[PDB]
Amino acid sequence: PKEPEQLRKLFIGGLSFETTDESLRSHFEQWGTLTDCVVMRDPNTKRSRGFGFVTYATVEEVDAAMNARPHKVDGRVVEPKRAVSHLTVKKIFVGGIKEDTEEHHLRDYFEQYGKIEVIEIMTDRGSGKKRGFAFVTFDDHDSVDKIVIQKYHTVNGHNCEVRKAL
Question: With 0-12 CB in 10 A as exposed, 13-18 as middle and 19+ as buried, what is 42?
Fold first, then answer.
């Protein structure tokens, strides 16, 4: 069974206006099999709109392409993002961790999604007791984009609720 197509697709912004379907494809085929690759153009002038999308055969190929950023395509550094589920942030809310979840629990799990810069375990302003939720800040948005499309997150035995934090 194939992963849903929406999860295999990358928005590429910031294209050179000279990038074509063919040159975008030739670039991004370095990181996997592309089932689709389109530069968006004006319907009348055919002038590029400066963005496009590519679709890989598998999510692991999407990961490989994102891990190979920065991408310089036809001389210009472009901006790939996974398709929306774009609210582009580097921080997540992690709920449901209760009072026994510590920093190392959160770090050991989330470090495999991206490079962590801040872990904030929330405590009561008056008593200092743990409130049962936390924020994790990464150095880049793709970590968050991978995290929030998962159906489940299990950390320290708890089924957690994870969302983008703004």
Answer: exposed
